[PDB]
Amino acid sequence: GNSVTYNTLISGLGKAGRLEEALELFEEMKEKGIVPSVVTYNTLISGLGKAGRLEEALELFEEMKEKGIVPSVVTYNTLISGLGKAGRLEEALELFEEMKEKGIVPSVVTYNTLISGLGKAGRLEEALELFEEMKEKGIVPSVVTYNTLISGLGKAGRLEEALELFEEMKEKGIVPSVVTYNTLISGLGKAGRLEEALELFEEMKEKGIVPSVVTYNTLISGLGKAGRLEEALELFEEMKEKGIVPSVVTYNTLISGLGKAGRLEEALELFEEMKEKGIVPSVVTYNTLISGL
Numbered sequence: 001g002n003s004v005t006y007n008t009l010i011s012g013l014g015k016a017g018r019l020e021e022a023l024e025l026f027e028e029m030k031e032k033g034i035v036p037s038v039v040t041y042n043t044l045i046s047g048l049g050k051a052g053r054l055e056e057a058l059e060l061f062e063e064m065k066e067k068g069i070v071p072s073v074v075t076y077n078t079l080i081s082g083l084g085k086a087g088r089l090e091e092a093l094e095l096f097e098e099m100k101e102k103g104i105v106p107s108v109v110t111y112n113t114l115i116s117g118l119g120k121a122g123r124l125e126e127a128l129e130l131f132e133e134m135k136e137k138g139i140v141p142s143v144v145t146y147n148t149l150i151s152g153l154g155k156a157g158r159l160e161e162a163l164e165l166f167e168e169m170k171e172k173g174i175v176p177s178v179v180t181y182n183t184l185i186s187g188l189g190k191a192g193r194l195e196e197a198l199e200l201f202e203e204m205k206e207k208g209i210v211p212s213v214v215t216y217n218t219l220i221s222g223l224g225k226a227g228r229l230e231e232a233l234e235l236f237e238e239m240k241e242k243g244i245v246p247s248v249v250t251y252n253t254l255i256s257g258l259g260k261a262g263r264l265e266e267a268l269e270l271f272e273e274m275k276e277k278g279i280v281p282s283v284v285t286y287n288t289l290i291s292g293l
Helices: 004-016 020-028 038-048 055-065 074-085 089-101 108-120 127-135 142-154 159-174 179-192 193-204 213-226 227-242 246-259 265-275 283-290
Strands: none
Touching: 004 020, 020 038, 020 055, 020 127, 038 055, 038 074, 038 142, 055 074, 074 089, 074 108, 089 108, 108 127, 127 142, 142 159, 142 179, 142 213, 159 283, 179 213, 193 213, 213 227, 213 246, 246 265, 246 283, 265 283
16 A cells, blocks of 8 residues: 555545544554645545534645645635635635735635635625636636625625626626525615616516515515505515415515505405415504504
């Protein structure tokens, strides 16, 4: 047993999940003073990552550094992924800087990862810039990345820039996720801009993706306060003739907007129809029927 034996053996242990034994195997691949392969390090360290075991992985990465062994994307990208899941962002950005300083090219999933991170930790403006580096060196922003920026801006209330990133999204060709559109919906909705919203709902239902219940709900909430009851009923019987389950929020909304605009009976049979589908009639609905008699 020299080298590649050990390595493939580790390929097997690794895939089997028998990792501690692999680490110990490394201990015997080191005690007698031997050098493993970059492949081995990659896999072993990847396992180290997946199973949380991160710091040891870093130390082994440094050990690899003192061995002259050159990392390779998936290596770094892993490290990064690890540090990111644990939110140790800045250190990972540091190592990423090391990466680009040693000539190795950050991938797309790389930036995607960083951005996932920095977005999660809110520091957005630091990351938009990473993303713009990302375009300036060519690498295509996958839907992941974009949607990240989108949710970011969304909760940050930059609004406009996002829509730009959104209308430069579809134009670039890539497909806008569902979560995207529903979040955008939250965007325009909060701002109470029904028009541009609904038209983006038109722009989404025309591309082959299906709106979540949340979209409907909020939409008809905005409309719920907007007094355009009719088109809301339209979207909600459409909701029926689309399959989506009307949440208690939605039903309570319609019934409240109907409780805002009299009609009475329709809402009562809507209340029956609400029960027949199994639901928890919230007291606010009841009080809605109170404030209308």
